[PDB]
């Protein structure tokens with residue numbers, strides 16, 4: 001059943017934290033709905049009484065969107081996690097409170113199916129889907145939103161009336177706009193999503209629920225490279241080769257689209273760089289492409305990696321390559337920035353990166369992660385979904401995590417220093433339409449709002465949404481005219 | 494709904510692996526029941542046709558019990574994971590397919606409750622509960638079976654008729670025996686459990702559902718000690734002090750029972766030892782006991798630890814200290830042995846341990862884990878439940894994990910060499926009734942069946958069940974007269 005957790009309830013303390021402990025969520029109360037109807041009734045009460053609301057699914061927000069500005073009510077959606085066949089026609093319905101782990105297990109166990117969900121199994125569908133969603137399978141399957149068929153969402157009209165509407169991929173008029181806005185517009189903007197329905201493009205769909213087939217086996221490999229064996233020149237060589245491989249091998253449908261690499265380029269205090277690579281073993285039984293990719297990175301250089309891994313079944317291999325809600329990632333303070341890369345950075349940029357990775361800094365959880373991108377993602381056009389980046393080949397995440405609030409300035413300083421110098425030639429940000437193509441709204445970065453940090457002249461909304469912002473604003477005016485749903489980086493009326 | 498996965502189904506490959514990849518589970522088919530009735534109907538069809546059956550919940554078995562001897566049918570129970578208030582009107586019912594993670598989240602989120610479930614969140618309730626179940630909260634709350642109120646189980650009688658029976662803590666006669674047998678008898682022995690109901694002893698129970706209250710906050714700390722700073726003498730000193738602290742401070746109800754330590758005493762190739770400690774912050778707001786305990790271990794020695802951690806809310810803190818189904822623990826081959834310690838080992842034993850931790854061996858996932866024990870566990874008498882160890886103060890797990898089948902012998906050899914020399918004075922095993930008290934059935938060790946490995950004259954069933962074995966055999970004869978449920982270490986008729 002549905003229940004409420006107030007300020008005096010002992011569970012409030014746990015609920016007041018999302019994953020990123022830099023931020024706190026302190027409403028007058030949390031409501032934990034059990035059904036979409038519970039969501040509607042809860043929102044209706046709140047909006048009628050003029051109370052401020054927000055929702056939360058997995059709590060993975062990189063920013064303080066849920067708890068800031070101060071809310072009277074937060075709807076925590078984790079009980080809405082049902083997964084099942086879609087009521088009408090093929091496809092699959094997923095409650096917005098389901099986590100990636102729950103979805104991956106259900107899709108595989110029930111239908112031998114897979115969607116391109118991310119590498120962190122605790123992420124909630126709510127925010128992940130609304131912002132686009134990419135993962136290890138995206139070079140084969142595209143973005144999660146590329147499989148979206150419908151969104152069921154609680155919305156608030158100009159008369160303060162809450163309705164549960166369902167917008168479908170084949171809708172036109174206002175409903176068509178609401179559907180499109182959820183294909184990358186980002187969470188916290190239009191209403192409270194209660195469920196998503198997924199139906200894959202014809203060329204990716206298989207029986208019996210119209211989703212893609214999970215690979216029978218995956219090659220999975222993790223290679224550790226000791227920093228002690230790497231000098232600046234070989235670092236630049238390895239990094240350049242990583243990017244150049246992607247420039248060549250990121251076309252939709254190519255054999256190389258079966259491979260996905262994640263390069264953890266760690267601060268030197270970690271002692272090592274770590275390359276993870278996976279490849280669909282159905283496509284390439286011997287894993288030849290993976291082996292050639294890995295070997296090519298360090299050939300000639302004096303750098304020798306220590307590999308581990310093997311060939312695993314799908315669910316076991318996926319978990320081997322994933323990050324769950326356990327251990328040192330829990331209860332941490334963190335900051336992350338993002339960039340889309342259309343082409344290799346210059347060698348000078350790679351030297352800047354090397355220099356900051358050797359700064360005197362407590363960097364045991366500080367790194368830049370470079371992920372393969374493109375492939376099937378790049379089959380669609382920039383305006384087909386709200387996500388506009390459809391010709392990038394590597395996606396980077398720039399990350400630091402730490403424990404003590406007293407070190408916030410230190411860690412934010414290191415991250416900002418690195419990102420801003422790396423992109424100094426373009427105002428300290430990865431501007432669109434050049435070697436880079438802006439940023440990903442699921443790694444939101446409030447520094448992009450500040451002229452001291454962003455001297456590019458390109459506003460946050462263009463870095464995240466490019467030319468799709470106008471249509472998003474129209475959808476916002478139409479569907480959330482009172483700006484009921486808002487946060488520091490919400491779509492403007 | 495319920496479905497079957499046969500040899501030709503692509504999902505069969507994933508299902509053929511449990512957590513420990515040393516073993517394979519290859520039945521003619523897996524059946525995935527959705528309800529207890531599905532279990533009964535599936536078992537009935539199988540036993541009528543003379544087909545061999547076994548079940549699996551979380552897949553965490555340390556041995557090959559599920560897939561060996563060859564089975565015609567394996568019932569995979571993960572869909573039976575419902576959690577809710579007991580129908581009787583008091584307590585909570587938990588499906589046997591629920592994992593520790595599912596149970597911890599549900600108990601906390603719904604009722605601010607907690608049970609002493611283990612430190613690995615992917616373990617299934619099915620096997621965990623039947624074998625006893627201990628965890629970080631056991632010094633306050635006892636074993637999981639100490640909270641068991643009922644077991645709902647599918648059993649097979651002499652006429653090959655399957656019936657779903659519910660045996661309760663207040664039952665007498667045959668049902669009383671069936672209930673008692675599930676309080677430590679171990680999984681795979683009596684029938685297929687479909688659900689457990691939990692109701693805490695009066696002194697531990699709270700509103701609203703008769704379970705214990707989850708602590709408001711936990712002190713959590715992880716301390717890393719570099720092997721480079723530790724010589725044999727200081728190693729022995731640290732280990733001795735760890736054990737002596739527990740000899741003094743493991744009485745039921747003491748302030749020190751709010752503390753739980755896990756000491757990962759790693760092979761030298763890992764470079765470090767790691768001590769984890771948590772303490773109930775409601776009991777000890779300043780965490781003085783924790784701070785004193787940690788300081789005492791290395792006082793005098795030249796060993797300096799590097800601490801991290803803090804004070805966290807219950808669910809976040811529990812996850813911070815826990816191991817989930819992700820990363821390097823996935824897809825691995827492993828072997829584990831166990832021992833109950835009633836008193837400190839001799840310094841000579843601790844020197845043996847030191848020597849093997851320095852052996853030329855690939856030991857990056859080889860370690861001995863020492864866990865705080867006793868406290869509330871030790872309130873009950875040895876015959877009150879099927880678990881007989883009720884006066885131990887430290888529990889150890891002796892572990893190695895690796896990837897390649899070709900190294901099975903190497904790793905088994907290292908682990909056997911260490912355990913057998915450490916316990917050489919008592920036949921190579923932790924005999925009962927001395928400095929040690931035998932072994933834990935949830936870390937089953939088939940080596941205890943071989944005279945080359947066990948020269949103590951104490952058979953496996955006495956090491957695990959001591960004087961409770963006779964009553965277990967009687968229950969087995971009564972409730973599984975055809976030996977439908979059996980494996981390499983199952984209770985004998």
Ligand SMILES: *Cc1cc2c(nc3c(=O)[nH]c(=O)nc-3n2C[C@H](O)[C@H](O)[C@H](O)COP(=O)(O)OP(=O)(O)OC[C@H]2O[C@@H](n3cnc4c(N)ncnc43)[C@H](O)[C@@H]2O)c(*)c1C
Nearest residue numbers: 057058059060061118119120124126127128134187188193
């Ligand atoms: C922490 C983390 C995030 C990751 C990780 N790995 C990713 C990957 O491999 N691929 C990716 O595409 N993204 C990865 N991400 C990022 C997540 O995609 C984002 O952090 C998501 O936005 C998280 O979603 P969720 O966990 O639901 O976050 P919340 O904090 O609950 O909400 C974020 C934001 O969205 C709004 N919102 C949530 N739910 C709804 C619904 N139901 N309807 C409307 N709006 C919703 C919130 O109010 C808030 O505004 C790996 C890691 C470790």
Ligand SMILES: *Cc1cc2c(nc3c(=O)[nH]c(=O)nc-3n2C[C@H](O)[C@H](O)[C@H](O)COP(=O)(O)OP(=O)(O)OC[C@H]2O[C@@H](n3cnc4c(N)ncnc43)[C@H](O)[C@@H]2O)c(*)c1C
Nearest residue numbers: 550551552553554558611612613617619620627680681686
């Ligand atoms: C892998 C692993 C195990 C751990 C870990 N941490 C523990 C902890 O902190 N405290 C503990 O008390 N135990 C810990 N364990 C050990 C687990 O407790 C044992 O490994 C359990 O037996 C695992 O249970 P489960 O995951 O359900 O294992 P299975 O392999 O499915 O079954 C084992 C055994 O039991 C029978 N069985 C399962 N289900 C039932 C039902 N419903 N009814 C009767 N019999 C059942 C199986 O047939 C098999 O014989 C940490 C880690 C990483």
